[PDB]
């Protein structure tokens, strides 16, 4: 969806995606 508190954009040097096989919030 889209809220007025979140802007729509995408920095060209970063790829927005998540691998389904890895759980995020880890390093």
């Amino acid at each position, epitope marked *: 969806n889209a*809220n007025p*508190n979140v802007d729509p954009n*995408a920095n060209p040097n970063v790829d927005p995606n998540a691998n389904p096989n890895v759980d995020p919030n880890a390093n």
Partner: antibody
Amino acid sequence: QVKLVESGGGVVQPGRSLRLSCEASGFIFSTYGMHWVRQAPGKGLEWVAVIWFDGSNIYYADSVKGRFTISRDNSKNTVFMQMDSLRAEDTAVYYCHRNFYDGSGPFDYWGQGTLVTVSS
Amino acid sequence: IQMTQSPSTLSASVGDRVTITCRASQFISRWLAWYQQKPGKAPKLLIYKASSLESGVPSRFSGSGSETHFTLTISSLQPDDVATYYCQEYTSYGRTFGQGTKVEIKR
């Protein structure tokens, strides 16, 4: 860095008006807007008002009414609020809130807090 | 929109599993956040999107849930994590806070 400071606290004769103003320093306005939030003594938090940059929605909480007019100064990046027709239960602590979510993370920047009390 | 928190008062020993419920009323997507306030200070943001994490937050905290039912879980307690937790909602312009939840210790 970014800091928020407010002023105007003090004792007030019940039935008399009072003015609140939040000072914004360390950044430039005209991005998303600000909020006012308060906390009753010993209770949970509660929402009060909202003001975006320039003329926008001025949505208020149902517990209060048009007696809580809020406006932004045209020259500087300050927000004003008018208090009037107070009650015995309106004593609380008023904070200053400005939150907006971007594509890289969150930003919170909470205020400091001032005290307003009513008595005789 | 009325928003309620079920577990008004919780307690546990040094290291347990504690669960909190933030069941809303209306229909919202994954738009929710949690705040932790220590006495005599200002709140702090903990998680957003009901599943993500903040920066510089211990990995023990981990939210979950979707649609309407939302839960928060802690793997181990430690004495440092005694505070009050509020569950928020930031759909559209207005924001309405929760009701409150206090966690304590027992020796």
